[PDB]
Design a protein around this ligand. Structure first.
Ligand SMILES: Cc1cc2nc3c(=O)[nH]c(=O)nc-3n(C[C@H](O)[C@H](O)[C@H](O)COP(=O)(O)OP(=O)(O)OC[C@H]3O[C@@H](n4cnc5c(N)ncnc54)[C@H](O)[C@@H]3O)c2cc1C
Ligand SMILES: Cc1cc2nc3c(=O)[nH]c(=O)nc-3n(C[C@H](O)[C@H](O)[C@H](O)COP(=O)(O)OP(=O)(O)OC[C@H]3O[C@@H](n4cnc5c(N)ncnc54)[C@H](O)[C@@H]3O)c2cc1C
Ligand SMILES: Cc1cc2nc3c(=O)[nH]c(=O)nc-3n(C[C@H](O)[C@H](O)[C@H](O)COP(=O)(O)OP(=O)(O)OC[C@H]3O[C@@H](n4cnc5c(N)ncnc54)[C@H](O)[C@@H]3O)c2cc1C
Ligand SMILES: Cc1cc2nc3c(=O)[nH]c(=O)nc-3n(C[C@H](O)[C@H](O)[C@H](O)COP(=O)(O)OP(=O)(O)OC[C@H]3O[C@@H](n4cnc5c(N)ncnc54)[C@H](O)[C@@H]3O)c2cc1C
Lengths: 390, 390, 390, 390
């Protein structure tokens, strides 16, 4: 009766459509993505085609209704993220950005003109987007951003000056969703396009996490943005923070995919690998580790399902997402690390993949809110007292 | 939108009946049990009346259909356990025994005569029962039990000899469900009654955990048991192990009640207690602890709900129960310990209750399968390889 | 070559005198203290005689030179604390107070008259002292104390008003060293004596930690203190904090005694206790725990030795003591908890002693600076930035 | 008085020579090694010159007396390892191999001819050596090695067949110390030299740990070894295990260097980096982490000193080394991981170095005995019962 691959029977909680979506995508991930990841991660190569392929599959911005989007459930989105990360976090990162940080904001805060113009191309993967929020001196604290947008009443345009750093996709992006503080004090979102004079996106080197993902900066040297390129629905941090919650939800699901991959790899290895005349799996010390991995993965999976259902009922609060994002990323990191220890020397070889996941989850536990920041977010909600600053 | 008392909205997952049952019982627990626990735990006093009271409420053996039992869902049973333990583990222990270790076996493995005869009295709390499995040299390993039952073909009866130890309720029990190895090699269950010649149940002293619970031994000096007092439905360890899973399920839910109590107490204390001119809740170190407690409690609550639903569909496997029992008891223990540290000096006073829960959860994490035994149970299920012995 | 009872050979680091002192005291502790601890802890009984006995042995205020004191090394003091706590923390607490919190301050900040008058009696155990610093609203933050001392220029005396709580020895104390804020803003130390009008010391009930220790309050209802009873060498928090470091040093050593006791008990139990046809010690899960316990104990022992040597050279800084106090108390707590889990059901019985140590170490990790406060103390020293307040 | 860079004043425990040695080497490491590590690690480049340079400095095989070796203390050796690893584990690995796994065995188990012939060249870095013990199917269990050596009575030589894997330095080694099982059942050590027919040493690719170190295999296709190339002092596992303890001792010290580097980097970063209008160092959550790092580093440093002193007195047992190797490597890993989390996004860049140490320590915690194997080694010593196998 017990199936270690699905202890609490998540399967019977999914709809036929969700199950169908998951399996279909899984096939694509295993057939087209797994075979390119080894060298991609080793030589820091991101295949632009990947976005086009996922575009044809209609996986980009799946929860969006209309504009060429699937219009599927939040749970389906979570299931998609899990299958992508089961392969690699870098790949899932590229998809999170396109879906939740680029398409979503244009959909929720954009004008109908902007939706009509960008969504269809983004959905089909014709345009690669990026989300510019973080800056050299503004990470956990967005109120410290220095990127400014000055209004030109005569030209009915804005002039942007600033630097965004650690931006996923920027080096090969076509559309840039940038957040800058305005003269009125409010921070707004601007749509920039490659080619605009004064806009640069150099690549960041020396990464030892999310190597199969393109990461760069966004340097704006007096970039002039037409008024029509401004997002009319966002005013102050609420716009970005809102988008952030959608990306974080996808992340809470995704890391479970990476964990499951690590669990499966460690398990099979423990059964195949022999020392002292028996398989490693025969040892108590080894079995306890496997039990811990399965336990944490399971608790996170069913919690994510619940959040996904609440989300579709418009009953999901940002704190809920922080709770699972923080929990799953932290737990996922520990799992990948244990798995690495379990494969011994072979574990430091990327040929065995676990080392790649352990490295990748390092970055995942940091971006979209650090583990400690999310704790403080929960702390504020629990006590009603803010403790970020002094 | 966010309610820290129910982060993922468990409430909307419960039926009106379940909610009604929970609240009704909660009222009883807060009005009748909380007021007696301070001194009960301090002076090791178990109020026999408690079983009668719960009997009138019809909370005893709630999942049983007929025989004067409520016939409620597994989730309802879990909800009941949670409210009882929110008060004290010792109290919930007395109820777990009566319901899952005494009534359940008589219901599933007993003859119709035994059901008709015992269930109604047990349901109303007229009879206090106990479950005798563990022995001085047989704890984590039941195959080592030395209690033997010899058959008397002439009298059509059995003669039992042995010692059961660390038995909840034994000192004031009326009915004893004892497990002994038979001459044929199979271990069977026998129903003994206070008064039988050769049967003794002395109390155990020096307990510093579950003090409000009566704990003793069961000494059998050639006790003669009529054949009709044997449970015809059990043959070898499967009978007790089966019952054990039902008790463990209730335990997985219960410890969450104790955790929630500790969380609420620590939280309120952090808000009321002031040092350095501000409430303790203002400190980052304090807020992280609260965030961790809420996180673990939440993951366990929704996992338990899922298990409860599967259980009512007859799709629950023993491994599922081990996973949650091990997880929730371990996590609950850490939570009570953190809470104790958070109340400082006052935390070692039973007047603040947290110290009582921390002590109680010590025993809970040990009985009904130790934390490590459950890991091995999961390990066997995951690898297909047994690692209990060498 | 390897001796698990002393992995890094601490023995060859001790002087013949230190070794002699340790063994002599050990004999007393095992012969006179161990036999009374079971019931003492169970019924909350502190034997006043214990202080007289240690007085005859000359163990009280051992580092003090003259006044009938041994005048031994700091390491000897640490060794003494370790042997006392190997028996019980409550007992070591009574000795820490007498030696470091009562005798030391009178020795360092007192007038020659006060030394001549009190030290000899305290050294011989004729007088039982206590240290009154903590108050209901002043624990981790001493600047919040409300006990005030008003000067009476005419009578050349002070009038004290306030309440000290959670004070070790107060219910049966003869001498009270109380700290109160003065009209000039500075906090001074006053010597009070039982019998003074307005002075009350009721006992605290409901303790589930350090039960063999007498703990009470110090209520001062307009107590008049002669000027000669004021400690001329202390002015503001430096006096108490200075004394505190001496007590904390003894604590860092002591908890290692309790840990060693828990390690030895768990080890022997694992060898004697059999399940699954072999001793528990045969299991990998069990052996890892023992390895962890030995490792932490060893690291702490040699660190304490080093601190002790520096101390005698007047090169010990308060931060050094915080580091070891915080480390050893935290680690000791984990060790006792693991040991308790290792003895299973029997572990919750005080007959097996481990449960007593686990409970006791709860209080030890809280008093003389909480685990988190000491972290902040280290944090300030490392960064040069204070983070206690906001 | 308190200096966070040396809490317990290790400095006053070192001799003038040891201090002189440390500082002299430190200068070399910071001036010649630090500047090459960034790209070395990034592009997997090991500079052969490094061994020549350390050879001129006389740091190779420092504890050896004569043969052109320094003949310094064990503590000096530890101090050297700490300064090397403060730069990079890969670099220290190359030195550990040359000193403890190549020079030491030739010194202790070799013939005078072999010493005269190899030591002088190894000491000056003229020859690069490697230690071949591990095989594809023989890691934690050496008794499973398949490399065999057949004796040729006629030629008075041996023929070796087998494969060694994960061997540090092999791809550019001149001398190979290989261990093979003989026909008599005993395993002996053979000295091979590059150029011998049938000997191959291909490089291993895909490493994501110790990248600045050359790692390869040793394939022996019927390699013929003269009798004079056999180590006359080793017979069965004792030879390699003996050498292993010397390398492990150096490792226990070394990882503390990497930890200190991570602590210093995280600390400075916390002081320079600002968010929410204050330096990160102002936050409680940040300060606790720093306190933990300093605590563990300190406990390990003084324990290592003690072991080093015992070693020079020939009183060091293998278990002592396991205890510190296991402890320091495990703790060092946690420290590097925390530091990485503390630098946020920048932490995944090798430009900030912490990510390199975290990756490197992964391998260090695995080789020379895994964390769990060392636990079992301690477990056997503590209980007298072996638990490696079943
Ligand atoms: C691979 C990768 C891809 C990324 N892609 C994008 C992208 O597409 N778009 C984008 O906008 N950003 C992106 N980012 C950046 C991510 O959003 C930011 O890295 C994160 O928000 C940045 O904070 P920080 O790195 O400056 O960390 P900081 O937090 O400033 O500093 C690091 C440490 O400080 C701690 N800390 C901070 N404040 C406090 C406090 N008040 N109390 C206690 N502890 C505190 C943190 O928890 C952490 O441990 C990416 C980052 C990475 C690594
Ligand atoms: C308050 C209380 C009430 C109880 N009430 C009842 C009752 O009503 N009815 C009843 O039948 N029993 C009862 N029990 C007993 C409980 O069921 C048993 O205590 C538990 O099953 C007993 O095992 P043990 O205590 O002997 O532990 P043991 O496991 O024998 O030993 C303790 C340690 O050994 C470890 N260990 C054991 N085997 C292995 C292995 N193969 N590998 C690795 N580690 C191992 C355990 O995990 C544990 O840490 C009660 C116990 C308590 C404390
Ligand atoms: C058995 C026993 C015997 C004692 N004997 C004596 C005695 O003889 N003499 C005496 O003077 N005292 C004595 N004490 C009291 C001890 O000195 C005090 O209990 C301790 O200093 C009191 O602080 P608190 O209990 O109020 O804790 P509080 O710290 O006020 O509150 C508890 C929690 O708040 C946390 N906290 C507090 N401030 C901060 C902050 N700024 N940031 C983050 N976290 C914070 C603490 O770390 C802790 O977890 C005794 C206590 C006990 C339990
Ligand atoms: C960078 C690097 C450099 C190296 N350089 C050298 C060198 O120069 N010379 C050399 O000889 N070797 C070298 N090695 C290899 C090192 O000595 C071996 O990797 C280690 O001994 C190999 O064991 P394994 O990798 O097969 O692990 P295995 O232990 O076989 O398997 C991995 C896991 O199994 C666990 N495990 C194994 N047995 C048990 C048991 N009985 N009970 C419970 N758990 C168990 C381990 O603890 C571990 O977590 C190097 C390795 C690396 C990564």
């Amino acid at each position: 009766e017990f199936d270690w691959q699905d202890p609490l029977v998540l399967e019977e909680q999914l709809t036929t459509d969700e199950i169908l979506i998951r399996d279909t995508f899984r096939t694509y991930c295993q057939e087209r993505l797994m075979p390119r990841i080894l060298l991609a991660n080793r030589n820091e190569v991101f295949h632009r085609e990947i976005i086009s392929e996922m575009g044809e599959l209609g996986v980009l911005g799946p929860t969006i209704k209309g504009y060429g989007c699937a219009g599927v459930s939040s749970v389906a989105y979570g299931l998609l993220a899990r299958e992508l990360e089961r392969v690699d976090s870098g790949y899932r990162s590229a998809m999170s950005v396109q879906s939740s940080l680029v398409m979503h904001p244009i959909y929720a805060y954009g004008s109908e003109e902007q939706r009509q113009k960008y969504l269809p191309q983004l959905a089909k993967g014709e345009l690669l987007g990026c989300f510019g929020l973080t800056e050299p001196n503004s990470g956990s604290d967005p109120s410290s951003m220095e990127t400014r947008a000055h209004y030109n009443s005569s030209n009915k345009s804005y002039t942007l000056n600033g630097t965004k750093t650690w931006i996923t996709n920027s080096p090969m992006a076509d559309l840039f969703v940038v957040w800058a503080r305005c003269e009125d004090g409010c921070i707004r979102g601007f749509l920039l396009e490659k080619g605009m004079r004064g806009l640069s996106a150099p690549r960041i080197q020396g990464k030892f996490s999310l190597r199969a993902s393109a990461t760069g900066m966004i340097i704006m040297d007096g970039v002039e943005v037409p008024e029509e390129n401004v997002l009319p629905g966002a005013s102050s941090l609420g716009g970005p923070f809102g988008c952030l919650n959608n990306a974080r939800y996808g992340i809470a699901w995704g890391v479970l995919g990476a964990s499951e991959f690590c669990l499966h790899t460690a398990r099979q290895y423990a059964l195949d690998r022999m020392q002292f005349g028996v398989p490693l799996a025969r040892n108590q010390l080894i079995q306890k580790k496997l039990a811990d991995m399965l336990t944490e993965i399971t608790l996170g999976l069913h919690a994510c399902l619940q959040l996904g259902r609440l989300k579709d009922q418009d009953k999901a609060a940002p704190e809920m997402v922080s709770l699972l994002k923080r929990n799953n990323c932290g737990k996922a990191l520990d799992i990948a690390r244990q798995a690495r220890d379990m494969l011994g020397g072979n574990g430091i070889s990327d040929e065995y993949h676990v080392i790649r996941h352990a490295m990748n989850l390092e970055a995942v536990n940091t971006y979209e809110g650090t583990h400690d920041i999310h704790a403080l977010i929960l702390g504020r909600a629990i006590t009603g007292i803010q403790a970020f600053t002094a």
